[PDB]
Design a protein around this nucleic acid. Structure first.
Lengths: 204, 125, 96, 93, 198, 32, 176
RNA sequence: AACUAAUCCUAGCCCUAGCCCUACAAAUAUAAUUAUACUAUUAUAUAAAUCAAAACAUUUAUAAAAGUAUUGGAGA
């Protein structure tokens, strides 16, 4: 049984300078031709789905999901996110302790584009400052700063199974814009191994 | 017909006719190198070489020139968990040479980010 | 065949089975049947059904006409003995 | 020796169940019934020891007589052999 | 042999129930064919479990363990494709539900109403609610193999529909062997000598 | 709970069945 | 023909071969005696070809395409035999009344048990056959002890199963 | 916080009660399990002893009246 589908039905293309930017909201109205028919499909099963008010509900799930990581609330996190999202979030955090906090959001969240036997997928735009610090099994710090805020802009996709009566909005994936800055480097150092050769072979 | 009683024949009795045949045969790729006309067959232990000739000639209309047959002893070395010897079923291999200049060859059946490792790629923070 | 005295094999033609192979040309039945074809409820044949299908109609016609007597049981299909038939129902004298 | 690492399952006993609550009723059948039925008549068990008691040899001997006609040949022979050993010990030592 | 979620005779089943297993037997209350009321495709409400109170449709029934399987209910999470190269992806995997953990649903009123088995005019047994007596018709479920009898198209070695349904038997006082002789006209005048059966 | 009915011995004449194998011989005598 | 021993060349290498359901007993009953005889060979021919392919698959250590085909053919052949046997059985009772095709009777073996003895064909009568008379159909006196053991063993069997049932009941009480 | 090990509850049984019982094919007593001829085909006397009599010899069990009258190397 699958309650989510990997990938995005229609990939929204973020425009450079959107962070600087009413305005963008009108662009959705201009682009409602592509998305409003999709919005109707979510509305048909729900009828309370509005692009203006959806981000608040989605934002709570996104923030809550990250909070579960601090407490390792795997059971809670499963409900918050779809099955596709969960493996990425927690697999690499095994035997690690992370302190995550949410600073005030820089800009209000707004729905960006939606494209759904029926899995409604809604793209949301979020810019928020957060704090991250990950430590080793021994407690040694390996990544992030305990009390320094980092401003991150990302687009988050939630997915709900419209057909199922029990279907609910769960985070499915995050769309990363190319203009987004690179992630912070790790504290530890890595080594790129040299070419491996047999005794007969010689270095080149 | 196998695992059945055949009617006893006495002088003046009818010819023995098997209207329905229980003998089941399978063509096998020859393990050893044999002449192309020669064909290997696995047949029930109660079937005679003459029956195979009649069987092929009547049911399958296959002309046969010569027949050679052998009985293979099944290995009983294998034992189960209870230490009871397991016997491989004994089978008879028949080498059938085709007639009328026909030649046979076995058909070809079944022709995270590298820069940031250990941190889940989901995090953008 | 028979092994006689002097350790000599003498094949007997009658004891050698002959495979009677029917002609499959014009026969419409094949190894498998359609899933489209509905299955038939099993109704095993019994002596009562066999007698009713074959023997009953003759007697019913004869009984109304009155041309029935005990002596003529063979007339309606009774076999006093199985001898003379190539296939004897009892004792069985033919192979499967 | 080594001992269980877990407690046995809890047992709950009802002391006012019909069997325990009504145990012994009619034990005064003789005095309260005009002695028409003796309380020994209320004994339920093997036939050869209903209203009777004795030592093992007496019990075994009484058992043989009561159901000897219904005893298995193997059982009867085994009982006889056991009685023979018992007889010598009690009646000669 | 302890019946499990894995189909009997599977590789996992052999590991689960080895021939030398001598574990404490599992108790499953025997349920008669008349007593049993749960069938695949029946909408039922989970009395207890992870998803208790959520109505679902049955998709698999292991009557040996009195287990009813609901798709998308009593569902846990596990990794699909977990391998050396890839971490793996979470999937939703159902867990067995015992018969007492579910009850049939009345179509008119959605509730877990106790039912009693009784026949109908057509003769088909139908479960009838003990309270608010109503007829719960047998649900329609597709064939497990996925082969629709009507849609099936004859392949090689498959007879046409008409040929199979043709009846050619003519009742007569002759066996198959005799009938074959009559059609093929085999003639043999020799007769076996008397055989002393004993 | 209520106690079961008291055990009672059946009164009145009772005639053993002569044909029955189980019944002892002495119970079929004229003295009986 | 040799080609009949093998599957269709087009089907060779395919994952499966499309086949329908096996012949049911009722349909075979509708078919005539001559039709039933022909169908037996048709099923037999398919069965032999599938057997030949399966044996080659085992040698090649490869999967057999559509193994259900052999099962369907075997079921059809079994259904054919009983339908033909039913007609043979019905006629035998009508003309002779004998409930078994082979002459037989109930006889007592040397162990004291009563077993159905199937008669055998002989060219000479029993009294002129010393070897047949040599066969023993009588129970020795020492079997009387065995007969008592059989009655006791039957009684013991009832006790053992009850003990076995009691142990199973412990599971019911223990689990619940 | 260590290796070897250890831990478990039913597998089942036991005694009484109840109850007499009347539960595929093919091949076989030939050399059993060898599809048809050979070659006729067939068990069993008291149970004893051991044992007890400290050996050993006649001898040594196998509802109440009553272990009484009796019997016994009058002894087990």
């Amino acid at each position: 049984h699958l309650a989510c589908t990997a990938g995005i039905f229609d990939p929204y293309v973020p425009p450079e300078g959107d962070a600087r930017m009413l305005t963008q909201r009108t662009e959705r109205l201009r682009k409602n031709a592509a998305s409003q028919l999709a919005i109707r499909k979510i509305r048909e099963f729900d009828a309370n789905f509005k692009t203006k008010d959806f981000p608040e509900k989605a934002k709570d799930i996104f923030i809550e999901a990250h909070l579960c990581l601090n407490n390792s609330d795997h059971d809670r996190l499963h409900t918050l996110v779809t099955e596709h999202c969960f493996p990425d979030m927690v697999w690499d955090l095994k035997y690690k302790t992370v302190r995550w906090g949410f600073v005030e959001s820089l800009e209000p969240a707004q729905v960006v584009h939606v494209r759904c036997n029926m899995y409604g997928q809604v793209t949301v735009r979020l810019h928020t400052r957060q704090t991250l610090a990950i430590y080793d099994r021994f407690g040694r710090l390996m990544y992030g700063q305990e009390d320094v805020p980092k401003d991150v802009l990302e687009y988050v996709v939630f997915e709900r199974h419209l057909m199922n009566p029990y279907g609910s909005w769960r985070m499915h994936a995050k769309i990363v814009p190319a203009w987004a800055p690179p992630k912070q480097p790790i504290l530890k150092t890595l080594m790129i191994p040299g070419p491996q050769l047999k005794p007969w072979e010689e270095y080149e | 017909a196998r695992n059945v009683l055949y009617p006893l024949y006495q002088l003046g009795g009818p010819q023995l006719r098997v209207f329905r045949t229980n003998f089941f045969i399978q063509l096998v790729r020859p393990g050893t190198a044999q002449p192309e006309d020669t064909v290997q067959f696995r047949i029930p232990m109660e079937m005679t070489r003459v029956d195979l000739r009649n069987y092929l000639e009547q049911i399958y209309n296959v002309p046969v020139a010569a027949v050679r047959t052998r009985v293979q002893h099944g290995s009983n070395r294998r034992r189960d968990h209870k230490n009871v010897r397991i016997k491989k079923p004994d089978y008879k291999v028949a080498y059938v040479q085709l007639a009328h200049g026909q030649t046979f060859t076995f058909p070809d059946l079944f022709p995270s980010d590298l820069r940031c490792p250990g941190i889940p790629s989901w995090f953008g923070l | 065949g028979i092994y006689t005295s002097d350790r000599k094999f003498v094949q007997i033609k009658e004891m050698v089975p002959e495979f009677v192979v029917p002609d499959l040309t014009g026969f419409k039945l094949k190894p498998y049947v359609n899933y489209r074809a509905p299955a038939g409820i099993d109704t095993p044949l019994t002596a009562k059904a066999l007698f009713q299908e074959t023997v009953a109609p003759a007697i019913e016609k004869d009984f109304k006409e009155g041309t029935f007597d005990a002596n003529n049981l063979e007339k309606y299909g009774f076999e006093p003995t199985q001898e003379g038939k190539l296939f004897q129902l009892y004792p069985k004298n033919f192979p499967r | 020796a080594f001992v269980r690492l877990t407690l046995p399952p809890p047992k709950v006993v009802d002391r006012w169940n019909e069997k325990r609550a009504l145990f012994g009723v009619y034990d005064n059948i003789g005095i309260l019934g005009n002695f028409e039925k003796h309380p020994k008549e209320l004994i339920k068990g093997p036939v050869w020891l209903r209203g009777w008691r004795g030592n093992e040899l007496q019990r075994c001997v009484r058992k043989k007589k009561f159901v000897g006609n219904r005893m298995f040949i193997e059982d009867l022979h085994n009982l006889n052999k056991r009685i023979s050993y018992l007889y010598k010990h009690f009646n000669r030592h | 042999y302890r019946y499990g979620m894995s189909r009997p005779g599977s590789i996992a089943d052999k590991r689960k129930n080895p021939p030398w297993s001598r574990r404490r037997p599992v108790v499953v209350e025997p349920i008669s064919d008349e007593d049993w009321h749960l069938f695949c495709g029946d909408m039922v409400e989970i009395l207890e479990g992870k998803d208790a109170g959520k109505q679902g449709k049955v998709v698999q029934v292991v009557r040996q363990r009195n287990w009813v399987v609901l798709e998308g209910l009593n569902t846990h999470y596990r990794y699909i494709g977990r391998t050396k190269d890839h971490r793996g992806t979470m999937i939703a995997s159902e867990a067995p539900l015992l018969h007492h953990q579910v009850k049939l649903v009345d179509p008119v009123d959605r509730k877990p109403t106790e039912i009693q088995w009784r026949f109908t005019e057509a003769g088909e047994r139908v479960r009838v609610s003990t309270r608010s007596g109503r007829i719960i018709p047998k649900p329609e479920f597709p064939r497990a193999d996925g082969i629709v009898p009507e849609t099936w198209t004859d392949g090689p070695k498959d007879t046409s529909v008409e040929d199979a349904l043709e009846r050619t038997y003519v009742p007569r006082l002759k066996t198959l062997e005799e009938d074959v002789m009559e059609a093929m006209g085999i003639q043999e005048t020799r007769r076996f000598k008397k055989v002393y059966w004993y | 709970y209520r106690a079961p009915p008291p055990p009672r011995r059946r009164p009145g004449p009772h005639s053993p069945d002569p044909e029955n194998l189980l019944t002892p011989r002495w119970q079929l005598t004229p003295r009986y | 023909g040799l080609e009949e021993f093998f599957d269709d060349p087009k089907n060779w290498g395919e994952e499966k071969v499309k086949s329908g359901a096996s012949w049911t007993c009722q349909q075979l009953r509708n078919k005539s005696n001559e039709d039933l005889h022909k169908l037996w060979y048709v099923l037999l021919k398919e069965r032999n070809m599938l057997l030949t392919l399966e044996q080659e698959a085992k040698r090649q250590r490869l999967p057999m395409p559509s193994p259900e085909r052999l099962e369907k053919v075997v079921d059809s052949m079994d259904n054919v035999d009983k339908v033909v046997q039913e007609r043979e059985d019905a006629l035998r009772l009508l003309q002779t009344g004998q409930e078994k095709p082979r002459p037989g009777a109930w006889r007592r073996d040397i162990f004291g048990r009563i077993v159905w003895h199937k008669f055998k064909q002989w060219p000479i009568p029993w009294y002129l056959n010393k070897r047949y008379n040599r066969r023993r159909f009588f129970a020795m006196p020492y079997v009387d002890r065995f007969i008592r053991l059989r009655i006791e063993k039957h009684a013991r069997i009832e006790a053992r199963k009850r003990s076995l049932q009691k142990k199973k009941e412990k599971i019911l009480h223990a689990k619940f």
